[PDB]
Amino acid sequence: NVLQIVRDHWVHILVPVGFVFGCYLDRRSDEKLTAFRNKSLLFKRELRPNEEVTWK
Amino acid sequence: MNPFASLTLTTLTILTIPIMMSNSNIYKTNLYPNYVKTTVSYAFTLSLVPLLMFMHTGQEMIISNWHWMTLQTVELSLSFKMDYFSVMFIPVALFVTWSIMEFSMWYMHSDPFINRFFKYLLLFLITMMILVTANNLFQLFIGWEGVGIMSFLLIGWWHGRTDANTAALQAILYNRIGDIGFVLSMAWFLTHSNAWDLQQIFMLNNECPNMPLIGLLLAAAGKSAQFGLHPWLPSAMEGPTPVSALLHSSTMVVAGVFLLIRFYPLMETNKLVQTMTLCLGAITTLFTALCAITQNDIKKIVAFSTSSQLGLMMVTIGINQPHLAFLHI
Amino acid sequence: TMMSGRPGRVPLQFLPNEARSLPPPKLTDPRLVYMGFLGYCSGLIDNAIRRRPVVSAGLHRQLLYVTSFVFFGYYLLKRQDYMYALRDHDMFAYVKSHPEDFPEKDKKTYGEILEEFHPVR
Amino acid sequence: MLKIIIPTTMLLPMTWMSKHNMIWINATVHSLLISLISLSLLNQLGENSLNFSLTFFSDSLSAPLLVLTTWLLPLMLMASQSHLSKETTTRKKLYITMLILLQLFLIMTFTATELILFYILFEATLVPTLIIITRWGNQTERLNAGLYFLFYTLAGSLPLLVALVYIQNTTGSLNFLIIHYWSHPLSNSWSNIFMWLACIMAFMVKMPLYGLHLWLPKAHVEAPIAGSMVLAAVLLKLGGYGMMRITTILNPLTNYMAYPFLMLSMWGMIMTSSICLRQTDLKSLIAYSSVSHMALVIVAIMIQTPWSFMGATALMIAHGLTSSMLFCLANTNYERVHSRTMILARGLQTLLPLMATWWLVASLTNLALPPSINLIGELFIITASFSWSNITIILMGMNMMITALYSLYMLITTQRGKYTHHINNIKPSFTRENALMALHILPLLLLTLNPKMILGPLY
Amino acid sequence: GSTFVAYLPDYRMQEWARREAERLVKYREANGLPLMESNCFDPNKIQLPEDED
Amino acid sequence: SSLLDLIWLETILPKTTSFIQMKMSIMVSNQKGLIKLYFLSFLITIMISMTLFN
Amino acid sequence: IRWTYARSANIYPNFRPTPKTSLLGALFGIGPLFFWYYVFKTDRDKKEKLIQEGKLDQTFNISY
Amino acid sequence: HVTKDMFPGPYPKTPEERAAAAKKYNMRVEDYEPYPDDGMGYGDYPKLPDRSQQERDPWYDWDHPDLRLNWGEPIHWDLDMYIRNRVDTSPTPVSWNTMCKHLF
Amino acid sequence: PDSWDKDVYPEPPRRTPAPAPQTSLPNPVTYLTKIFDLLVDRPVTLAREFIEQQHAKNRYYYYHREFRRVPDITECEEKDILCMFEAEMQWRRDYKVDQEIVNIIQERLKACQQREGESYRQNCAKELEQFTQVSKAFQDRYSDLGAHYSARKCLAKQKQRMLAERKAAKEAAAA
Ligand SMILES: CCCCCCCCCCCCCCCCCC(=O)OC[C@H](COP(=O)([O-])OCC(O)COP(=O)([O-])OC[C@@H](COC(=O)CCCCCCCCCCCCCCCCC)OC(=O)CCCCCCCCCCCCCCCCC)OC(=O)CCCCCCCCCCCCCCCCC
Numbered sequence A: 001n002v003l004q005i006v007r008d009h010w011v012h013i014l015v016p017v018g019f020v021f022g023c024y025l026d027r028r029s030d031e032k033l034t035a036f037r038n039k040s041l042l043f044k045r046e047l048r049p050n051e052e053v054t055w056k
Numbered sequence B: 001m002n003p004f005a006s007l008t009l010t011t012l013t014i015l016t017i018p019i020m021m022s023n024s025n026i027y028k029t030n031l032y033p034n035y036v037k038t039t040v041s042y043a044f045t046l047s048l049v050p051l052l053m054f055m056h057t058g059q060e061m062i063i064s065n066w067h068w069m070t071l072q073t074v075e076l077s078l079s080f081k082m083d084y085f086s087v088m089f090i091p092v093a094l095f096v097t098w099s100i101m102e103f104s105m106w107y108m109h110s111d112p113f114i115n116r117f118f119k120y121l122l123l124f125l126i127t128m129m130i131l132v133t134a135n136n137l138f139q140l141f142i143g144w145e146g147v148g149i150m151s152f153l154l155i156g157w158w159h160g161r162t163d164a165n166t167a168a169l170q171a172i173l174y175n176r177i178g179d180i181g182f183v184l185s186m187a188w189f190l191t192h193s194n195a196w197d198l199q200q201i202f203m204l205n206n207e208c209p210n211m212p213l214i215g216l217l218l219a220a221a222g223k224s225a226q227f228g229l230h231p232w233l234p235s236a237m238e239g240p241t242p243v244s245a246l247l248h249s250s251t252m253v254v255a256g257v258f259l260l261i262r263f264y265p266l267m268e269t270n271k272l273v274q275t276m277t278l279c280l281g282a283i284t285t286l287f288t289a290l291c292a293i294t295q296n297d298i299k300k301i302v303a304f305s306t307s308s309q310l311g312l313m314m315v316t317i318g319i320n321q322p323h324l325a326f327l328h329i
Numbered sequence C: 001t002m003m004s005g006r007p008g009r010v011p012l013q014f015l016p017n018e019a020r021s022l023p024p025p026k027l028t029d030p031r032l033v034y035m036g037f038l039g040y041c042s043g044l045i046d047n048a049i050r051r052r053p054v055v056s057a058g059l060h061r062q063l064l065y066v067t068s069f070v071f072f073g074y075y076l077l078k079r080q081d082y083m084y085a086l087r088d089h090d091m092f093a094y095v096k097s098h099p100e101d102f103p104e105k106d107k108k109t110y111g112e113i114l115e116e117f118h119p120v121r
Numbered sequence D: 001m002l003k004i005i006i007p008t009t010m011l012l013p014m015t016w017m018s019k020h021n022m023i024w025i026n027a028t029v030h031s032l033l034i035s036l037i038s039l040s041l042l043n044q045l046g047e048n049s050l051n052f053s054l055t056f057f058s059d060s061l062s063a064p065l066l067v068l069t070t071w072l073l074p075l076m077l078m079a080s081q082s083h084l085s086k087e088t089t090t091r092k093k094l095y096i097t098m099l100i101l102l103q104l105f106l107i108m109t110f111t112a113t114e115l116i117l118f119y120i121l122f123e124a125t126l127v128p129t130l131i132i133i134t135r136w137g138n139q140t141e142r143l144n145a146g147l148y149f150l151f152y153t154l155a156g157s158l159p160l161l162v163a164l165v166y167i168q169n170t171t172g173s174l175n176f177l178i179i180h181y182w183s184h185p186l187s188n189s190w191s192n193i194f195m196w197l198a199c200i201m202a203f204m205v206k207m208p209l210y211g212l213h214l215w216l217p218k219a220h221v222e223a224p225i226a227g228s229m230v231l232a233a234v235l236l237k238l239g240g241y242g243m244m245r246i247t248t249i250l251n252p253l254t255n256y257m258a259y260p261f262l263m264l265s266m267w268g269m270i271m272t273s274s275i276c277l278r279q280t281d282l283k284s285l286i287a288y289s290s291v292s293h294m295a296l297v298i299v300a301i302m303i304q305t306p307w308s309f310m311g312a313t314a315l316m317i318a319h320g321l322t323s324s325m326l327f328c329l330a331n332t333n334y335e336r337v338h339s340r341t342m343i344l345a346r347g348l349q350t351l352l353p354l355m356a357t358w359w360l361v362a363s364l365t366n367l368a369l370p371p372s373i374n375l376i377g378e379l380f381i382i383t384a385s386f387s388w389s390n391i392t393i394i395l396m397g398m399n400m401m402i403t404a405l406y407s408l409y410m411l412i413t414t415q416r417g418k419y420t421h422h423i424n425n426i427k428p429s430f431t432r433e434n435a436l437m438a439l440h441i442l443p444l445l446l447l448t449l450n451p452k453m454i455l456g457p458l459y
Numbered sequence E: 001g002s003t004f005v006a007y008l009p010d011y012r013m014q015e016w017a018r019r020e021a022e023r024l025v026k027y028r029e030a031n032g033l034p035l036m037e038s039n040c041f042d043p044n045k046i047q048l049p050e051d052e053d
Numbered sequence F: 001s002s003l004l005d006l007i008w009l010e011t012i013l014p015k016t017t018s019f020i021q022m023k024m025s026i027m028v029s030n031q032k033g034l035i036k037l038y039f040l041s042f043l044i045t046i047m048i049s050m051t052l053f054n
Numbered sequence G: 001i002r003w004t005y006a007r008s009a010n011i012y013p014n015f016r017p018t019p020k021t022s023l024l025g026a027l028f029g030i031g032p033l034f035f036w037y038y039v040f041k042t043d044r045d046k047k048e049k050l051i052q053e054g055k056l057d058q059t060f061n062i063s064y
Numbered sequence H: 001h002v003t004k005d006m007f008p009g010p011y012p013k014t015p016e017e018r019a020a021a022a023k024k025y026n027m028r029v030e031d032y033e034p035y036p037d038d039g040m041g042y043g044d045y046p047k048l049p050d051r052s053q054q055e056r057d058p059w060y061d062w063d064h065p066d067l068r069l070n071w072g073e074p075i076h077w078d079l080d081m082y083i084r085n086r087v088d089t090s091p092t093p094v095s096w097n098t099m100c101k102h103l104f
Numbered sequence I: 001p002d003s004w005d006k007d008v009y010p011e012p013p014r015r016t017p018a019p020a021p022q023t024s025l026p027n028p029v030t031y032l033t034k035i036f037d038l039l040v041d042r043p044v045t046l047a048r049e050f051i052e053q054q055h056a057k058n059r060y061y062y063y064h065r066e067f068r069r070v071p072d073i074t075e076c077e078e079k080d081i082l083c084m085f086e087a088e089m090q091w092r093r094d095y096k097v098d099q100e101i102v103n104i105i106q107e108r109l110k111a112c113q114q115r116e117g118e119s120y121r122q123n124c125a126k127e128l129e130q131f132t133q134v135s136k137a138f139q140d141r142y143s144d145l146g147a148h149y150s151a152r153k154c155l156a157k158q159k160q161r162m163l164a165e166r167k168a169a170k171e172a173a174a175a
């Protein structure tokens, strides 16, 4: 019964929320170290006609 | 195309089916021994064909089918060598095993765990086939250890008996003493020849030094129960009669002589190692015959007879007659 | 370093006016969130000491602890960032005014640099 | 990397807000889910590494250890589920909190871009395990074992802090990437010799090196099952990981400074193995076998060759799994007999046949039977030592021989022969214990199919 | 998880190395080049130190 | 086990350190609480500091 | 219980430093270490001398 | 259930504590004999005959038939050395020196 | 089979002598092989054709990754970290490539040894010589670098090798 099992099983949501939140944190870090995006000598590539960034 | 490879791999493949069925319902009935015996007979009659093909023409093949891993410049892959020795020893071993299992269906009728006994016999047979058909030192070592551990498990068949346990531990001890030399040979070969595959070892070693052949001789002496390490074979009679008849009389024991046969091109280029092999064989055969002369237990007498025969085969190895030694096997 | 005697320093200023030229820390700064977590832990310990339901004894008191910790943490972060900015400013000024003590190293390539080689055996 | 750390941290509020009779279920489920998530880290490159951020990174050496650390926690929970039946809910939650904190500290220890952060977390791990040993310990010697375990490690690791800060002040950074790329040779000087000793002793005391191993049998005997599990599987590998990381800056001094240690291991791996032949306690026997294996790993690391490094990594993983399995078996026997002596419970194969099968498989794995990863690591290290010097094989061979002996000894004394008559409280094995053993053993034989995942970055 | 580990993409670049090696040996055998070269870096780019001893 | 592991390896590092620390603690802490000796030591260390570090 | 306690934990309290125990401990704990050290140092020095002299024939020695 | 006073202690020096230790170990005072008082920590424990476990009587109704021990009897210090699966000291039809000389 | 290049893995013509029965007794080998085809090789080929046509119904391609050459360690400044990183990655990729080259040569040698049978000692001299040359080159390039191998250590080894060669050449010329 909804609103009855919730008070006992809401705790199962914590870890997956941590995982997604964790994924977001990793993504935030990635944006910061974009100082060399499409600037490495090995992967210096001209952009596509409908491209803005080599990777995200 | 070329049914030689297909049939030679099919024999080993179908030898393992009852092991997979050991969790099925047939393992909980009394029909399992007949099932395993029938499987062994079918494997033997199937393996009879590649031997016939070799007899007609002289077919030899290496099958490197699965690539296990690559370590820098070394490549370890699942390779089977199906030369004359393998295609001749497989039918003989399968015939002997079929006879032994048919006999055991009568000898071990009263044993509550007879299905486990047949399961163990089949496992030993699979490990022996793996040892014989191996093309690189790692697969050969896998078979070398498998036959030894299966002998340990089968000797201590009656685990409620102290003597069976101590005999099994003794066999393990002597075989590990041989394993020291086997591992020394493996390390030497990979360090110097940069490969464990037999073809590269044969190419790169025209004048084989003393150390790898010393290691191989030590391993062969350990597993074939030569004079230095003999007592384990006679003490290994604590096990059941069927086990002694196949594992210790005609199949597992000849592993050391077979290993020396496998590396016969390198043995003929060393004169000191052949002298040591001949001397060790001579002392082994005479000491074991002298012991068997006055023994009173029939099983011990035949065990000493087997040890003397193995010593004679090593003597044959010493005088540079490997094919004769294989025929005597 | 000892920036106590730095010239033009107001004797008892927590944050001088020149500290307002630096970017203020964001409210979602990890240090601020850590300070809030410390306040929450303090509230939980306070509830445990008084023998009260630890999680839900007083929501107002826990909120007060969290807010006070956040406030003081924000001020502390501003002061710390200002001090580090001063240290870097003094560093750069000194190296600019003393070129003889910091000569430009002649850029040398590895192709013309002999390094001894030690084999592993 | 945060996708592994954040759920582990969220494990704590989950445990503390769980029902009084559901803590084990949720803890096990979410630990297994975290292990599944951490399985993604096995995807590695032949290039440098997976540099997630400025603070954490992963390598082909850290990945197997992280996966093993994440896989360990469910097994520890299942092992500890039995003997904590009569414990208050708050204290069970404290125990699970200690386990979760230890896992979190190990997870952030194995990534550790910077050496000072690595030291901070590697010393932080000392607290939860010390509390576990000294609080939930059966015997009165748990206090002395905790003191020994704490003080050996602290005495070893205190000079390491001075060495690391000195390194940062001279070179300018402790980031591992900059350390590797800007590495310079070490001159033959007394200052550099003491630098080497400070950098090495902290990790060598935790392996443990022979002669510095007095703490390990005590900390293994007096700890609960979870403590023995974690300290035998992962906490011993902290020293090996540390030496593998730190040896990049100790060259070419290590070419001749390693001689005193190599001998101590090369002889020690023999001596302790012989100690295993005459032992009246299962836990002491397994602890001494662990000392022998870690001595062999020390030799591999000090040789400093590629094959040595891959063999050491494989041996670390295999030894961790096998030792945890053996300790689980010993604890299952203890929970029936309550004696922890080898000669009391005999002929157990007559009573518990599947447990006898588990004993046989664990002994075969400890015996280094091919093609198990135990033998892969053992053989790689043996070959590398043979290349180092042709005489080493002798000692190596002896050890191998002795190894098999005591393993089968442990199999024969406890399982074969005639059952003891006066022990009649030997209940049939539970499904929980059998599941624990299966979850221990199946990963070993699965890793045997793909060795390249545990052969380190030098593969 | 075992299936996921089995089918991991070749980020270690084994087949890439195989193919590159095949192309290099093909080229060097066709044009007669002596397979692998003893020097990893061309001597034209290293400024050696004159001894004058 | 007995001679090396249980006897001498325990004698060298742990037991020697424990014995030394216990003895030093006993020597340091064993004071009767008299300010006479305390101020006598104060005077001695004052003269030592005056005559030694300058 | 008495047998196990006597085997494990009753050694050190009954241990007294005597010339016999001191000499046996010194021998069995130091002699083997220095002996193996001398053996391996001699072997490796000989190998290094042969390598420097160039007369070792290290062909096909690729993996180390 | 085991008290502090029945655990093994230090080497007995006076006959009173010698008899007390003999009583503790469940053997006669005249049969009791501790190890010599050297540095090795044998201590209080009795010096039982070095006879192996194999040559014990195979027909006695022991409480432990496999190990051929009785419950409560003093245990040899090296029991794990003689467990019938290891070295045994049973008499042989030929003397030891003669066998060694002949094989050598 | 077109799955591999024939020139990289050269193989002999291996002409086989035609059957020449001398007696009237029918050899069971031919009957066994014919029943083997009839019972195994036909259904296997049928299933392979079915699978091949199923694959042909849905075709998609994958490409070999190309890498651009980057300045190496010999043209790198002392403390410049970015070009050092690029040089290190390039050197590691080259190292893997040479390892695979040695692997190919070793496979060639093993195949020659098995194929030529008991005439291998004379009929595989060319492969033995190629393997000797490649092994010498690889040992010169990459031996004794250690567990922590890097481009700078290889460069230092190569530089000391050039020192030895130059000194020996000068001494021989001035002998
Ligand atoms: C990188 C680190 C990451 C994590 C940080 C680590 C620390 C975290 C917490 C820090 C402290 C804060 C809380 C502690 C207060 C103490 C209260 C307590 O004892 O617990 C009772 C209480 C429950 O009990 P109760 O029913 O209320 O009443 C029982 C009485 O309170 C009391 O019961 P009792 O008196 O009847 O029972 C007595 C018992 C009770 O006595 C205690 O338990 C004392 C508490 C431990 C001392 C902590 C000291 C300060 C913290 C130090 C942290 C050190 C970290 C460094 C690592 C080293 C670890 C030592 O004492 C004993 O059993 C004696 C035996 C001694 C055993 C060994 C002692 C070891 C202690 C060391 C613990 C250190 C970590 C603590 C973890 C949290 C513990 C609650 O526990 C809690 O509820 C609090 C847990 C956390 C609440 C989570 C709520 C959040 C979920 C919703 C939001 C979701 C978040 C995500 C956002 C997005 C989602 C949408």
Ligand SMILES: CCCCCCCCCCCCCCCCC[C@@H](O)O[C@H](CO[C@H](O)CCCCCCCCCCCCCCC)COP(=O)(O)OCC[N+](C)(C)C
Pocket: B019, B020, B021, B022, B023, D064, D067, D068, D071, D443, D446, D447, D449, D450, E001, E002, E003, E005, E006, E007, E008
């Ligand atoms: C019990 C009664 C018998 C019933 C069973 C009968 C059937 C027998 C089958 C069982 C084994 C027989 C051998 C058959 C092997 C075939 C499968 C094998 O070939 O696949 C392996 C694959 O196996 C995996 O690689 C290994 C498993 C992964 C190991 C991870 C363990 C799971 C995580 C748990 C936590 C780990 C804790 C320890 C830390 C690491 C290797 O394949 P590979 O040649 O490479 O390439 C695969 C194909 N590619 C090319 C498309 C990629």
Ligand SMILES: CCCCCCCC/C=C\CCCCCCCC(=O)O[C@H](COC(=O)CCCCCCC/C=C/CCCCCCCC)COP(=O)(O)OCCN
Pocket: D152, D155, D156, D157, D159, D162, D163, D166, D191, D192, D194, D195, D196, D197, D198, D201, D202, D205, D212
């Ligand atoms: C199980 C317990 C083990 C405990 C650890 C044992 C190892 C102890 C390591 C030595 C202690 C001091 C390490 C210092 C940290 C390294 C820093 C360094 O090396 O810098 C040196 C400084 O080196 C030192 O000062 C070291 C002096 C040692 C002082 C403390 C002695 C401690 C005992 C030493 C003997 C025991 C060491 C081995 C013990 C083995 C374990 C039992 C250079 O400094 P500069 O003066 O600027 O350079 C000179 C040129 N201008």
